[PDB]
Amino acid sequence: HQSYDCVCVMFASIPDFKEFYTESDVNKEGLECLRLLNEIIADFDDLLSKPKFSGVEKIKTIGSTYMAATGLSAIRQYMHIGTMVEFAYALVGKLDAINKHSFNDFKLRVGINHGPVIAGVIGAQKPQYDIWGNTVNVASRMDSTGVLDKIQVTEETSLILQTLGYTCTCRGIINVKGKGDLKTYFVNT
Amino acid sequence: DMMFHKIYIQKHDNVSILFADIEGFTSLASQCTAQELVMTLNELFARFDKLAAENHCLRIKILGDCYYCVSGLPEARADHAHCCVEMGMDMIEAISLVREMTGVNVNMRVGIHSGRVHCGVLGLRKWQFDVWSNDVTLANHMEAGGKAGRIHITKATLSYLNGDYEVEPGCGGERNAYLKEHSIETFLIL
Amino acid sequence: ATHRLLLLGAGESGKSTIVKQMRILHVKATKVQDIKNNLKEAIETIVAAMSNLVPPVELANPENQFRVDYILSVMNVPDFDFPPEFYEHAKALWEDEGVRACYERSNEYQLIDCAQYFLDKIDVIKQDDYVPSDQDLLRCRVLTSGIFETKFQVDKVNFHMFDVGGQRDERRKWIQCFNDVTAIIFVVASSSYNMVIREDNQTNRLQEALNLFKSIWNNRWLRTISVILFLNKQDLLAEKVLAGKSKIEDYFPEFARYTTPEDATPEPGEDPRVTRAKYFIRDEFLRISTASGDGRHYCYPHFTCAVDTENIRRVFNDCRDI
Ligand SMILES: Nc1ncnc2c1ncn2[C@@H]1O[C@H](COP(=O)(O)OP(=O)(O)OP(=O)(O)O)[C@H]2OC3(O[C@H]21)C([N+](=O)[O-])=CC(=[N+]([O-])O)C=C3[N+](=O)[O-]
Ligand SMILES: C=C[C@@]1(C)CC(=O)[C@]2(O)[C@@]3(C)[C@@H](O)CCC(C)(C)[C@@H]3[C@H](O)[C@H](OC(=O)CCCCN3CCN(C)CC3)[C@@]2(C)O1
Ligand SMILES: Nc1nc2c(ncn2[C@@H]2O[C@H](COP(=O)(O)OP(=O)(O)OP(O)(O)=S)[C@@H](O)[C@H]2O)c(=O)[nH]1
Ligand SMILES: [Cl-]
Ligand SMILES: [Mn+2]
Ligand SMILES: [Mn+2]
Ligand SMILES: [Mn+2]
């Protein structure tokens, strides 16, 4: 496993799902709910096979959260950052589509960040590909501490996004354990 | 075929779910290099994946510094309860060797629970054998509201254990707001 | 040979009423309470809506003004013991021409349908030996929150009735029944064409149905599912139609052009005006089912009356041959 210098990590969770999930006798004991999640994850995967997103590499799916890294170049020089943002919006456009036929109002919460990461595989039994590094942590932290229908990015990230054409608003200060307090911004739409 | 996408998921009962997390990982994460960690990380779970096969526990997924295998899969086993306990048992000394060569205060927080679950895969890209069930969510919180170098089991995991292990009050309520909100009685393997 | 039927439709469209019939056909101290509740929550609704209406409705007997105060004082009692007084006061008000004058405008404010039914019979429910008749339970009304699966059998053939909340908030639970569903039963309050939804008090109850139907019909997860259409509440429709004061063309202008179909099969001694309207509401839905969905699913109209066991027994024998 090698180490990259500039990889854009993104997290798009759905905090509204956990409540949606319910193991009742009628829905096959939570089985039906998962079916809806399948139509969600799948719907989000149909984007990976799209020209403009040929650079987006889905890493994994944490529960009901989507994780994709843009910048691994496999499996401007910082343009992959803006692309990742376009993938975030892309997900939104599809989550809302689901609601249309689902009757829900599922809102996506995205936290994007970029920086050095260590891509590779771990686990002897069934080897799996995953990335490591402080970069991913901050990204995640900007998802668990974000806002529905909003993308939370750090300073350095906000700056680059602006050089790309995006406007950002300072949310305030967020605390990331082991890193203290940081200043995040919301990508204006 | 048509309408919806074939969901590759199957229901299961009488299984034990064990969650484990590195207590204070940022502790050494601020000491060891970004790479040294990934090594220790890969080194630890390595032994884990092997111990699991020895204790008959199936590896589910690795989340950073969180590792969780479930017993009773694929082939049903009425020994599931012990399998996880056994896992947590050996798992610990595996994270202790992390004190010898690296960061101190490194211990595992085992959180075991039993009940039905839903295993399989979602979406249609880079499938990841995962589980879904409130029982699974409970094991998670159990792990969260656990104690260093100790095993945190619920009331269900204790019944499936035929009381072959000596336990004690867990007080998970005053630990996790979930084990509290749901009025859950927790114990700790002595 | 076990079918899974899912009942869809807007709120108070008449879903739970149909399931009751299925239990009365192919299949109390506890419900009595509710019946009284429907009666209370009924009368108090009319009176309270007299001063708010524009123009405001005034009583015909100033005396009852006191009874009006009584009803408005116990409008929010936790466990109303329903004392002998209530009934006397209630009926007294219901008899007041002014109150009724306000009843005819029950479309200008949220009011249950069992109002007329129960009020006309206060002397029966006031009794201590009161025994709810099949019709009383069919006329009763209780909000359905969640999903309930009824299991009955007809001529040695298993069915699976599915009752879900027809209220906007509840509609999010429907999905849990979209997969592996034999047929969908879409109930509609044909009579509620001059009333507005309860969710916001501004969205037409019939339009809500139309939009809702269109959503289910054109749903990505129901491409091959055929939906039967129960244009329920035909009794209340024909009534309002014969009334002549709540013109339909004043809520749906397209009705000014509409002309009764030549393939129309009007019931015996059925007023031509009713026929020219009962079908109008039907065609409004057919256009939605004709716009798309071809060969993969169809729609089957069925004028119905959920509270009429003699009607649902008929129309249902048809839903079986489909
Ligand atoms: N939502 C998430 N999605 C994916 N990953 C997450 C997520 N949240 C946290 N992590 C990763 O997991 C580690 C756990 O962090 P955290 O939960 O705060 O702390 P502890 O382990 O200490 O447990 P405690 O909270 O005290 O009970 C972090 O260490 C690291 O990346 C982080 C990290 N870092 O934060 O900087 C650097 C590192 N290397 O190698 O440099 C390795 C980690 N790791 O392996 O997990
Ligand atoms: C799908 C429905 C539902 C309700 C049921 C379920 O079993 C979960 O998928 C588990 C429990 C389950 O899959 C075990 C792994 C994990 C990751 C623990 C999932 C998440 O907590 C889900 O929710 C979330 O995505 C929100 C919480 C995420 C926080 N986790 C906590 C644990 N650490 C280790 C990683 C981050 C989950 C709870 O969602
Ligand atoms: N007059 C008349 N009343 C009817 C008819 N069908 C149903 N009702 C009455 O309408 C009221 C509402 O019916 P109900 O079956 O509760 O609606 P619902 O679709 O189940 O509504 P919800 O429960 O999801 S919000 C009940 O009081 C019932 O007795 C009909 O055809 N005519
Ligand atoms: Cl309706
Ligand atoms: Mn940890
Ligand atoms: Mn962790
Ligand atoms: Mn109902």
CSV table of C-alpha atoms and ligand atoms in Angstrom, one decimal, chain A residues 11 132-134 137 140 177, chain B residues 22 24-26 34 37-38 41 64-65 109, ligand 1:
chain,number,residue,atom,x,y,z
A,11,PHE,CA,-18.9,11.3,3.4
A,132,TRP,CA,-6.1,5.8,6.1
A,133,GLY,CA,-4.8,9.2,7.4
A,134,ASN,CA,-5.9,12.3,9.3
A,137,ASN,CA,-10.9,11.6,9.9
A,140,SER,CA,-15.9,12.3,8.6
A,177,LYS,CA,-10.5,15.2,18.9
B,22,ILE,CA,-9.1,0.8,20.3
B,24,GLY,CA,-7.6,6.1,22.7
B,25,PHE,CA,-6.2,5.6,19.3
B,26,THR,CA,-5.4,9.3,18.7
B,34,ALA,CA,0.8,8.1,9.7
B,37,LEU,CA,-0.1,3.3,12.6
B,38,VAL,CA,-1.4,1.7,9.4
B,41,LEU,CA,-3.4,-1.4,12.6
B,64,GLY,CA,-10.6,2.3,11.2
B,65,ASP,CA,-9.8,1.1,14.7
B,109,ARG,CA,-13.5,-2.5,24.4
D,1,LIG,N1,-16.4,8.3,10.7
D,1,LIG,C1,-15.2,7.8,10.4
D,1,LIG,N2,-15.0,7.1,9.1
D,1,LIG,C2,-13.8,6.5,8.8
D,1,LIG,N3,-12.8,6.6,9.8
D,1,LIG,C3,-12.9,7.2,11.0
D,1,LIG,C4,-14.1,7.8,11.3
D,1,LIG,N4,-14.0,8.4,12.5
D,1,LIG,C5,-12.8,8.1,13.0
D,1,LIG,N5,-12.1,7.4,12.1
D,1,LIG,C6,-10.6,6.9,12.2
D,1,LIG,O1,-10.5,6.2,13.4
D,1,LIG,C7,-9.6,6.5,14.5
D,1,LIG,C8,-10.6,6.5,15.8
D,1,LIG,O2,-10.8,7.9,16.3
D,1,LIG,P1,-11.7,8.3,17.6
D,1,LIG,O3,-13.1,7.5,17.4
D,1,LIG,O4,-11.9,9.7,17.9
D,1,LIG,O5,-10.7,7.7,18.8
D,1,LIG,P2,-10.3,6.4,19.7
D,1,LIG,O6,-9.9,5.6,19.1
D,1,LIG,O7,-9.5,6.9,20.4
D,1,LIG,O8,-11.4,6.0,20.7
D,1,LIG,P3,-12.4,6.7,21.9
D,1,LIG,O9,-13.3,7.9,21.2
D,1,LIG,O10,-11.6,7.4,22.9
D,1,LIG,O11,-13.4,5.8,22.6
D,1,LIG,C9,-9.0,7.7,14.0
D,1,LIG,O12,-7.6,7.4,13.8
D,1,LIG,C10,-7.3,7.6,12.3
D,1,LIG,O13,-8.5,8.0,11.5
D,1,LIG,C11,-9.6,8.0,12.5
D,1,LIG,C12,-6.3,8.8,12.1
D,1,LIG,N6,-6.6,10.2,12.4
D,1,LIG,O14,-7.6,10.5,12.8
D,1,LIG,O15,-5.8,11.1,12.1
D,1,LIG,C13,-5.0,8.5,11.5
D,1,LIG,C14,-4.4,7.3,11.2
D,1,LIG,N7,-3.2,7.1,10.7
D,1,LIG,O16,-2.8,6.0,10.4
D,1,LIG,O17,-2.5,8.0,10.5
D,1,LIG,C15,-5.3,6.2,11.4
D,1,LIG,C16,-6.7,6.2,11.9
D,1,LIG,N8,-7.3,4.9,12.0
D,1,LIG,O18,-6.7,3.8,11.7
D,1,LIG,O19,-8.4,4.6,12.4
